[PDB]
Design a protein around this ligand. Sequence first.
Ligand code: SC4
Ligand code: SC4
Lengths: 262, 235, 235, 60, 272, 272, 68, 68, 68
Amino acid sequence: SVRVMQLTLGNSTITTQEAANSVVAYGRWPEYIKDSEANPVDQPTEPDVAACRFYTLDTVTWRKESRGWWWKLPDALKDMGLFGQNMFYHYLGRAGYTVHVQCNASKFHQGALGVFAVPEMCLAGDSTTHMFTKYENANPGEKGGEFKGSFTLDTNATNPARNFCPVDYLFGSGVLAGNAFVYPHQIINLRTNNCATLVLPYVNSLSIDSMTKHNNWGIAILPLAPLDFATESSTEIPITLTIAPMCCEFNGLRNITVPRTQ
Amino acid sequence: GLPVLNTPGSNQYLTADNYQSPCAIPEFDVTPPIDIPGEVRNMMELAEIDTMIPLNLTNQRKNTMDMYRVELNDAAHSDTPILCLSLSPASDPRLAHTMLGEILNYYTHWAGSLKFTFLFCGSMMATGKLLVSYAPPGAEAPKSRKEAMLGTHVIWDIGLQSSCTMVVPWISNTTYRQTINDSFTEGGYISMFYQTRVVVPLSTPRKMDILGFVSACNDFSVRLLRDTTHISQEA
Amino acid sequence: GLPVLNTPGSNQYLTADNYQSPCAIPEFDVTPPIDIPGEVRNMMELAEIDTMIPLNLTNQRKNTMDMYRVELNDAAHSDTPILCLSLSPASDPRLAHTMLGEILNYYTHWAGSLKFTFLFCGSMMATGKLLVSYAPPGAEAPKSRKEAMLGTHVIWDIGLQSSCTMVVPWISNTTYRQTINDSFTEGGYISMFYQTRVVVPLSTPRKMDILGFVSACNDFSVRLLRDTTHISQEA
Amino acid sequence: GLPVLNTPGSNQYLTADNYQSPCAIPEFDVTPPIDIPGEVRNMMELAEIDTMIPLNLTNQ
Amino acid sequence: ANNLPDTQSSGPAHSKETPALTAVETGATNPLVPSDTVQTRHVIQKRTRSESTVESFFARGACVAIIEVDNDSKLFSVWKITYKDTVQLRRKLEFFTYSRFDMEFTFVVTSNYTDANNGHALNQVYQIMYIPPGAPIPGKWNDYTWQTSSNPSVFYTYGAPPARISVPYVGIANAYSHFYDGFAKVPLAGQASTEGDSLYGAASLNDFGSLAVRVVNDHNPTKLTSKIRVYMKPKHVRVWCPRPPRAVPYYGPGVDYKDGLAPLPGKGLTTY
Amino acid sequence: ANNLPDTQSSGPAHSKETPALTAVETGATNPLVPSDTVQTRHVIQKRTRSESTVESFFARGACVAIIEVDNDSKLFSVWKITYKDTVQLRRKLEFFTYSRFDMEFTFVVTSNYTDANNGHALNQVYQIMYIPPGAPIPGKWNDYTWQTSSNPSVFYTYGAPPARISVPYVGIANAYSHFYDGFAKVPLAGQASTEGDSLYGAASLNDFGSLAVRVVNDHNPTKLTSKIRVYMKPKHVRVWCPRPPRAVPYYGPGVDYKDGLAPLPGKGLTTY
Amino acid sequence: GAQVSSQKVGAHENSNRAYGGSTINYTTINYYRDSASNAASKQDFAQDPSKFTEPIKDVLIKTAPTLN
Amino acid sequence: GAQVSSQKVGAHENSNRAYGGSTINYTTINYYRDSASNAASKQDFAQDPSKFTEPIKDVLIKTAPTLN
Amino acid sequence: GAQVSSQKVGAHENSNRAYGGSTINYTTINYYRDSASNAASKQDFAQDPSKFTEPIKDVLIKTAPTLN
Ligand SMILES: COc1ccc(OCc2ccc(COc3c(Cl)cccc3Cl)cc2)c(Cl)c1
Ligand SMILES: COc1ccc(OCc2ccc(COc3c(Cl)cccc3Cl)cc2)c(Cl)c1
């Protein structure tokens, strides 16, 4: 039925008994580069089962006060097994994804989470200096980031944070959040479903790019209807994020990249 | 040479003309296209996607995530409206900033049917019946369920299918309406009432939110491209 | 490029030209037409509809409803005219403001036949015979029935058919006449006389009105569009 | 004459245009060509010839 | 736009058919021709009604507005689009109740030094921007609105032949209404008198929007004034329901009158 | 750019099919039409979406720059090519993530005497030279760079109709990116913080090069200023991935915001 | 896409060209996509005035009595 | 090398030329070698919004229950 | 005397005219007698660089030893 599914990729399987169908972004399933759209001339590496499998990133907790969370792809998976290895050993890389967000509660809980997949999800910074966010802050990895309820300008001139300041109702980029529904999405309304499943093809203005310099997709999760339970002002339910890269192919092998951190 | 006669309009520059001109970079090897997902052919495609409506523009809620949440409760049945709206998709503050309203503000005329979808975000243990209504212009705006029920309406029963859609049919005198607040091309009123009441058992939240969405139907069209007031530039 | 040579008349603006120009609102979705009753194709269609003539322009009657009423009475037979008019449809004060005269004032030339219809508004008990006449220009304007009877005339017998039409045939030297008072293109005289007399029995009104109407025949045409003097604008 | 309408761009001089113009020396008897060795059709032909690289740019 | 019928010869009559007699009470006009009441000869008719067709009657550029700008807020002007600012075209259009056509607009631009012996300026360029009802109206001769990314603009260089553009049938109804016997609002029972009140005979508060005109050059202290005379010509014309023409002076956008109520002169009943 | 479907008549219903009920959690929009929830009549639809096609939406010349030159280094100016110097066209382009089109550039040139009663100059000729990233940039209004043996130049004579040229799709990628979630450099472990640092969302330091404008005439002591307004129109348009439009004021080339963060007005929940 | 119509010659020159041939025809070509840009053809038709001159239900003959 | 397309006539003149013939067609000829120099034809197609409106894996009918 | 060539369309409009018909062709006509007055056609051919890259008397294969 629309509600029961099983996803198998490599050596990993995911089962769900409360789905609300699955979304295939823009109606496009991920695919490899065709010869007619090929650019780099060298033989690509395609790890296949070693990289195209389900990786579970860290679990976040939803509370009445949560504003939202965000992650960047392939960034969030840079340290994930052999996918991360191939990402750092190659100059160029390409991949699609199957994003599976998990969140179960009970029949006496309420709340709705909007799960959006955004191509080129550029976020707003914290200073008066334009495009000032530094690489280390823009790429948090598997832990991702969070949305805020208001904009707060960083004034420390001696030691600028050079970080993002994504305000939730402004979708972290100066647009109204209610219009974010034009992007592939699903809603995890506690009275209806457990999860959200989105299949994302590779989207870019090029056939292949640098995975370290460029993040193709952004995953934004916003509480559309806040978490509430029985009478417990105190309520916490975890949100686990499991993502699997698809049709990975890398070009331009050399020595490994070791990016600067923190 | 060939005898010619210059007609009025010569040497002018019409910002909306469509002529040919010499290429400044001749014989340029243009990069071929690739099949990028999500291509768009018409702006109306975007107007047909559900976009969340900022229904709660009260002073404490406007410009926060709370402007999108309309709260309901398990109180005894009342005939007073849960919300009220005017069918002015491009000008009503609650509709003017949705994806639909944003596009309508780049055009002078609009025509067609619209649909409002409401999502119930209460717990699974909560039940209830609501009446969503649409009253064509010309009479007093409905203030009780009794008046609202006399116009176009959908009685929504809450359950498994979490959402309910009410189609606002194209009922107009003129062939196209204007994207500004104008009485001559006024559209009517949208309102919601409790049919019975929201009922929840013990150990369950007594207040919950509903979210509203708006999109255009397949018979919707706009015309006369104009500039929007939604973007400005000082100095 | 292609060698061209600019001829005199280039870059001018002829108010009556007929050229193409770029469209300022391209790809506009034009509202289709509906079949509205009463469409007009030619201005001459309007000139062929009977319009009431303001025959009585005396100081007390002009610019009142009385300017349209010409009164008759049961007096003994007289050879003096009931009314007199000049065939200058665009300039005679009595004809210049009828629908026919209004249209003629937007043109410089007119040609064709005209017809005058008179309606008897006396009681049913009233009887009488009248002589309506038309005298082509060139001789003395008729002042007695004896002179009028020598030209084109219709002897109207009053009865069941309340009205009578007299056709003023196109009798002209020039192929077209001017819409201004000019002797070279003068049209002649229209007059009415009592043939016998209006007779009424006792207990019946001895005075009654007749109304006149004027319209163009099917061989009527106008040419050379010009501006009318019937509308002005100060400052 | 034939009614025309001047479009924007008229009377300008685009350094990269490609139009016709009158010949200032009409009916000139042009010297015919001869088959000279080493003709070139494309600049890329020259880029495909090995050229020595100045690898040692040290001060001395 | 065609031919007229020939006159057929007609001889004497003595019959029971009387086309001269009629009854105008029916609401009809007696379709008589000369041969019905007099003896006629045969005339081969060559005159036509080619120039009185609805199209030829309106096929002239009429002035509808004179917009003025002083290049020393007057650095720019706004004209609410209408055909009622002038009287000549308005009176012709009002021979009919409804119309449907395309429009051709020609702009004649003139300028001059206010001072006979002072100031100087380089050739001026004008921008005529159409602001459809809803679009932002310029507050300054140089604010962001003049970017025209969507509004149609016409840039005219002084001295060039008059600018000219065509506009399609832009009505929101199936035809333009020259007369509207109604209101845009219906006052409801119970509401304050201030409520539900609107102008008689008015439709939208902003029917067709307006034109914003300005000189693009940087203004010099020199005293200069320019005037843009707008000429409009209806082309591809269709009209419905004829009406008697305006007899007394216009008094506003409505059918209101006040002043020249006695249009006809005096003339003796029996005076030729 | 076509037709809309007709409305089919629809009668009453009493069935197990309930199109009114749905579940938006799936991420889909309910494709209902009036006849799904009410009784409808048959209407033959004649309206079309001809003017809302991606092409017609952008088919307007929008101002992207106002370059100024003072013919008394200001004798020449350089403008780094971009669409972000203005807001109107930028906001429309940003409804999409990627685009691919040709460009038409029209140049409106105006000039004037700064002094109302002083100076005089003969008609000016302007040179608009395109300097592709890499070509030498002019240091003086008259140095060797203005020879343009390879760079495309446009020589405009003051008073002539606006100059206009077309540019092909010149991107180094298969489409123009309106948004780039990345950097041009990756800082490597071990290198100084000064190292490997670049702007967020920036690609090449010099994407499309710039325009160098100057007056070719020898400058006279007279005080004169000229302004070249650049208008650009995307033609032969294709766009990908729609995005919600900009709601708050722009704050630079990025998606940064700072000032008008509260765009919506107050309105009662139960107020019509 | 040229439209060739004939003119209604008023004043005739002492030529046979004034009476026949392409010399009494005129040529037209539309340059714009929008019909609004077009000029007026002026080959306009006429109609019956009856809707105004005789909007009578029961049709009557002029020779015959109107009031019957 | 002329391209002859037909116009979508909005307002119709009282002519038969407003309904047929080359009088409702427009002619086009490209003068430049580079396609960039060309004007926009504006004979643009539309498409299915489904990729945005219903990017669902398992296709669903509106009459049928969405959550099954 | 018109020469009709086809253009190499770079950016394609959402039209079928962008893919076929006279809409992707351009027309040319020479107005001057002297060929010098003509514009450049720009339909220019290429050639083998061998005269520069391999002006060798005894032809050699890259796989095979150059010095034999
Ligand atoms: C996504 O939106 C975009 C993408 C690219 C853009 O600019 C690319 C660009 C590249 C070169 C030139 C050079 O054009 C010119 C030439 Cl050859 C000669 C003379 C004048 C000009 Cl003006 C102009 C623009 C713009 Cl403005 C918007
Ligand atoms: C019944 O008689 C009528 C009906 C409508 C009329 O006006 C309608 C109308 C609507 C838009 C525009 C806008 O036209 C323009 C454009 Cl796009 C660009 C530049 C200049 C102009 Cl000018 C102009 C007129 C008039 Cl004047 C008479």
